Amino acid sequence: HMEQLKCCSGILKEMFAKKHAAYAWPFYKPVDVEALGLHDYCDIIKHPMDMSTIKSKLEAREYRDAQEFGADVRLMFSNCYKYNPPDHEVVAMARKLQDVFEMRFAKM
Ligand SMILES: CNc1cc(=O)n(C)nc1-c1ccccc1
């Protein structure tokens, strides 16, 4: 439905909000694969995903429903959990943002 997708746009807007910015910012745009320490990112992560790409996909009607949108949000988090050591600060930030997402996605 149009309504399901409108709710998805609302979840993504909250993920971009000032309230969550302290932990959401690494997910706003594609990972900078030219940064020092990120030389192997593309060899490990086959399908990079970020919040701006998801926003563009919603705008271009690339999701048929909420499950397709949710799969891209979860892909973004799973890339973070796969690539980094489990004790990395970015993994803790991904979990805080995933808490926001899962609670809204469950209640939509
Ligand atoms: C190890 N660095 C990262 C791992 C990761 O999973 N995400 C999402 N971002 C980063 C990152 C953050 C700032 C600058 C460059 C990369």
Side-chain angles (χ1 to χ4, degrees):
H1 210 293
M2 274 234 311
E3 285 301 308
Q4 226 178 65
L5 294 167
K6 277 191 213 76
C7 184
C8 293
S9 287
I11 295 169
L12 194 68
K13 180 172 183 183
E14 181 169 354
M15 290 167 67
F16 271 118
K18 276 175 187 72
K19 180 176 183 193
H20 307 298
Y23 43 90
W25 69 266
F27 308 98
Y28 289 170
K29 300 248 160 206
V31 170
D32 178 10
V33 302
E34 299 306 314
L36 179 68
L38 283 292
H39 54 276
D40 57 346
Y41 192 87
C42 291
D43 298 308
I44 295 158
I45 301 301
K46 300 301 165 188
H47 302 285
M49 186 51 57
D50 65 278
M51 293 166 52
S52 290
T53 296
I54 294 169
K55 189 166 173 177
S56 293
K57 291 182 65 172
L58 281 160
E59 289 173 354
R61 310 181 72 173
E62 296 186 46
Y63 303 118
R64 293 192 297 171
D65 56 30
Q67 286 299 320
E68 293 187 5
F69 160 84
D72 264 358
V73 174
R74 294 191 180 126
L75 169 60
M76 174 180 79
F77 296 133
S78 295
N79 287 341
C80 186
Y81 305 143
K82 177 177 176 175
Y83 178 69
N84 295 289
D87 66 339
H88 199 291
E89 60 182 356
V90 78
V91 165
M93 294 163 87
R95 288 174 172 163
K96 292 179 187 172
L97 189 56
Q98 185 165 16
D99 288 347
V100 177
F101 168 76
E102 298 291 340
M103 286 316 239
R104 299 297 191 186
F105 194 69
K107 294 179 178 168
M108 68 168 273

